[PDB]
Each structure stands twice: as structure tokens, then as C-alpha cells.
């Protein structure tokens, strides 16, 4: 009766392009996103993973450092990874043949200095990379290891507010060559907004742990996404504990009791959501092999032996 507790729908939904993994901090956004990307790489022609979170961990997750430009992930042929760069475009080496225009020099200096450290720069740069992708279409699908619920929601809202602002501007366009640039941007802006608002094009994977704080942070995140009308029809319960009846211990038993309570609460609350349950593993989930093994159970419904 209930929806299958697997991400099988995500794999089968081939039209899906933009995949967002988010939730409370430390739940496993990075690991789950890497696992999902690995699973997709076995189906799609080429998949990218972007660490929009300023505290990038995909390098640690895959045990292989990644630059700010997509790079093939070791051990895979069509899987790429990148970390968003808060800093603006680097300054090209001046020719120096002629005295540089101080106005543009200082404009670019401020552009690369002030807003580089501005609090909202990270999400804005992530959005800029999204625009670049909507201009490129180089990768079949892209998976975003987003920051926690708050900043991820800010990022997801940014396209809507920016599109509204550009629409207002174009209304005020009638009342100095930037007009062409605005008209060039606006198509890309509605394109990104439309893709984000289309369930067939994108979906948000909410990853959470069986605890009060994580549970209700995930609930708030889901409601905010519904306000943003971003489709989200699956949750990843992570770090679950399954006691071994042979040699049980108090810690594991109590943790299992708590997690069972909050997981029953989740299942009652999240009907019509593919709730895929990921057990806590006794080994570090890092490196291509471990990540692939973890993803294998991410797709096959885990059941304790």
C-alpha cells in the first residue's frame, strides 16, 4: 500500500534534471547526495554533483579533492563533481600596453572584493552556476548538496525574487547600453525559475534523522518548499540504528526506541512520500567503493539480517 521506501522513482524519472538534497545539518546530505549521484551515473549519460554548501564536503565524501570547475570523479567515467566558488571571476592579466581605465579597474576590484565576502554571496554564486548550467546543458542531471534548511530555502527562493525584480525593471525600462544585457539575462532567469517550479524537471530530496529536532526541521523545510511549490515526494531517513537481538546493548536499544518513535511519527506524517531508510554503518562512508556500497542499499530497501 505505501510508496516503495526507495529512490527508485528518482532513477526511473528520466526527465528529472535538477535534484536537491537538503535537511537538518549533519544528517548526511553530502553522503546521501553522493550516493544518489553515483546511482544516477549508472543510468544517465552524465551526472554532476555540486557542493553549494560553503562547507564543502564532497571532496571528503569521495576522498578526492575537486576544483571549482567540474572534474571527473575517480572511479567513474561520466560522474563529475564541483564546489561552488564564492569569489567572483578572477581578474585577467592586464595587457598594460595602454594606461588602464581606472573606473573599470576599481569597479571590478570592488566587485571581486566587497561582495565576495558579503553574507549572501554563496547562494548568489550557486544561482549563477545554475544559470551557467541552464546555458550549457552539458550534464544530464545535477545533484546539489545544499546547505541546511534555511540557506537552502533562501537559495531556492532567490530565482523567484530575482525574476520578479527583473520583471519590475523591464516595466520600468522605459523610464546606458545595459538594456541588451538585461534582455539577454531575463530569458535565462525565467528558464531557471520555470525548471525549478516544474516537478517533471526537478525534485527536492529531504534527508533527516529519527529525532525531534531533525524531524520538525524537515517538516518546516517541506512546508517552505510547498510554499515555493518545489516538488518533493521522498525522504531519506538516515543514521538509523537496528539493534542485534543476539547481543543487545543499552545504548543501541534506547537509540532504536527513540528512532522508532520518531520514524513512526514520520511515516504517519509523510504519507505519499517514499521514505527510504538508511542504517548507520560501522565504517566511514568515504571513498568511491564505500559510497557505492552505501548507495546500493539506498536503492534496495534495507532490511536488517
Amino acid at each position: 500500500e505505501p510508496l516503495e521506501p526507495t529512490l527508485k522513482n528518482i532513477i526511473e524519472q528520466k526527465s528529472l534534471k535538477w535534484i536537491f538534497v537538503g535537511g537538518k545539518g549533519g544528517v548526511g546530505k553530502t553522503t546521501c547526495s553522493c550516493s544518489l549521484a553515483v546511482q544516477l551515473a549508472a543510468v544517465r549519460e552524465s551526472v554532476l554533483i555540486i557542493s553549494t554548501n560553503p562547507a564543502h564536503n564532497i571532496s571528503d565524501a569521495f576522498d578526492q579533492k575537486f576544483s571549482k570547475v567540474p572534474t571527473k570523479v575517480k572511479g567513474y567515467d561520466n560522474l563529475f563533481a564541483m564546489e561552488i566558488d564564492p569569489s567572483l571571476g578572477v581578474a585577467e592579466l592586464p595587457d598594460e600596453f595602454f594606461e588602464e581605465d581606472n573606473m573599470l579597474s576599481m569597479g571590478k576590484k570592488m566587485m571581486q572584493e566587497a561582495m565576495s565576502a558579503f553574507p549572501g554571496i554563496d547562494e548568489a554564486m550557486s544561482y549563477a552556476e545554475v544559470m551557467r548550467l541552464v546555458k550549457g546543458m552539458n550534464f544530464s542531471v545535477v545533484v546539489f548538496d545544499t546547505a541546511p534548511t534555511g540557506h537552502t530555502l533562501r537559495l531556492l527562493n532567490f530565482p523567484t525574487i530575482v525574476e520578479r525584480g527583473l520583471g519590475r525593471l523591464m516595466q520600468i525600462k522605459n523610464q546606458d547600453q545595459l538594456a541588451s544585457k538585461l534582455e539577454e539575462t531575463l530569458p535565462v532567469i525565467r528558464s531557471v525559475s520555470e525548471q525549478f517550479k516544474d516537478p517533471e524537471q526537478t525534485t527536492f530530496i529531504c534527508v533527516c534523522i529519527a529525532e525531534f529536532l531533525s524531524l520538525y526541521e524537515t517538516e518546516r523545510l517541506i512546508q517552505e518548499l510547498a510554499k515555493c511549490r518545489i516538488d518533493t515526494h521522498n525522504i531519506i531517513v538516515n543514521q538509523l540504528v537496528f539493534p542485534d537481538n543476539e547481543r543487545p546493548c543499552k545504548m543501541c536499544e534506547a537509540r532504536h526506541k527513540i528512532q522508532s518513535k520518531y520514524l513512526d511519527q514520520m511515516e504517519d506524517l509523510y504519507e505519499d512520500f517514499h521514505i527510504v531508510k538508511l542504517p548507520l554503518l560501522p565504517h566511514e562512508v568515504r571513498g568511491a567503493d564505500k559510497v557505492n556500497t552505501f548507495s546500493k542499499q539506498l536503492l534496495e530497501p534495507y532490511s536488517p539480517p
Binding site: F212, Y216, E219, Q223, D268, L269, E271
Partner: protein, 271 residues
Amino acid sequence: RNRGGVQRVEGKLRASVEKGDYYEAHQMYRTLFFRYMSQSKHTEARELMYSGALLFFSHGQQNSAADLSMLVLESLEKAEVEVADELLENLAKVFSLMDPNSPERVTFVSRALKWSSGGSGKLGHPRLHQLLALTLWKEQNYCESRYHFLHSADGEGCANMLVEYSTSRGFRSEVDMFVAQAVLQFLCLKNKSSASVVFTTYTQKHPSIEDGPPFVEPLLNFIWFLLLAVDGGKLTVFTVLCEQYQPSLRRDPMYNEYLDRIGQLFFGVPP
């Protein structure tokens, strides 16, 4: 089965409320509200939210009750429910139950007023303004009570509150000026009948004011003549009254601009 989750959630909420786990009950109230709204059960969601807010108020859970009240306002807004007296009384009760100094009230009232006929003048039903003013007066929040009364449509209780406010706070010489200010502001709000009733009641009931339309205070006589002229609508009478009483109108300079509106509003004076 698919719906079974909601019933189990409601039962767990009841159990948590019984156990006294008030914050968890608040969170589950939020969850149930969102689930119901997703099903378009606006009325049921609003009733549940109202009951939860009342319960949280009864137990002293001020912040939780305020959050649930704001969810009630959200339900009213999203469903575009037509304003009804019962809902206004409900919102007034919720506002009264709140902590007077808590900022949520400011957020609540501004929203609530913005909901009731949110397309024009923050008016809604002046019944809501009257209820808020009465609640504030009982709380002795004279400033906001007076403001709402001015935006309300009840003058009798407004006049009584003005009398109490002047006696408790107004100086000896400001007695007439208080009612003059209130009346001129009513006229600035285009409510002539409210101004008439409030002036009549304030003059009749105030202990320090001698009964009789021929009031000793020049300002009261000026206000009476101004009301009569507004009834007549003759601009020349308004100008004469303003000129002859200038020494009294200068008692508070702002009166002048009020008159500028009044002449524009009731005597066709161009802006």
C-alpha cells in the same frame, strides 16, 4: 490507510496534550494545520488552530498560542473567508488573551486588520476595531484604545474611554481639547455620526463639563457649530467658524490642518 496517518497524528496530539508536552503538541498542531490545508479543509483547520491557541493560552504557553493564532490568520487569508462577526469576536478574544507588551500582538492586529476587508482602508468591520479598543481600554492601554476607537464606529464607549483617559491622565485645562481632538480626527476619518455621538456623550457625561449646548468653553461651542455646519455643508459657515475661533484653535496648532481636511472633505475645499 493513506489518511490513517492524519488520524494517528491527531490521537498522538491529544495524548501529548494530556501528558503536558505542550511544545510537541504545538508542533503537531502546525503539522495538522498544513495537512488539513493541503486537503483544502480550511474550516476544520481554522477551528483546530483556534482550539489549540485557546488551550495554549489557558496553560500560559504565550508564544505557542501566538503562533497558532497567526496560523489562524493565515487560514483566514488563504481561504478568502468572508468577514463575519463571530470570526471577528474570535480574533478579538485571541488578541485580548495575548501579552499586552509582546510584539506578536502588533504583528497579529496588523495582520488581522489587514485581513478583514484588506482591499480598502484597513477597515474590515469597525466592529473589530471596537472590540480591540474595548479590550485595550479594559487593559487601560489608552493610546491604542483611542486609536482604534478613532478607526472604529462606536462613539459612546469611545466617549466614555476618553472621559476616563482625560480624568486619569489629562490635565485640568485639556478636558475640552481632548474631545475636540477626537472629534476633528473622526471628521478626518469621514465619520460624521461617530463624531456627533462621541461629542454629545462626552459633553453630557464628563463631570467637569456643564450640561447644555451653550458650553462655557469656547472650544466646545466651536465644535458644536462645526458639526452643525458639516451637517449643512456650507463652506462660508466653516470659514467663519474657523476665523472667529482662531485663538481657541491655536491652543493646539495641528487643529488647523485637521480643518484643512474637514473643509476639503465636508465643504469641497480644493487641496
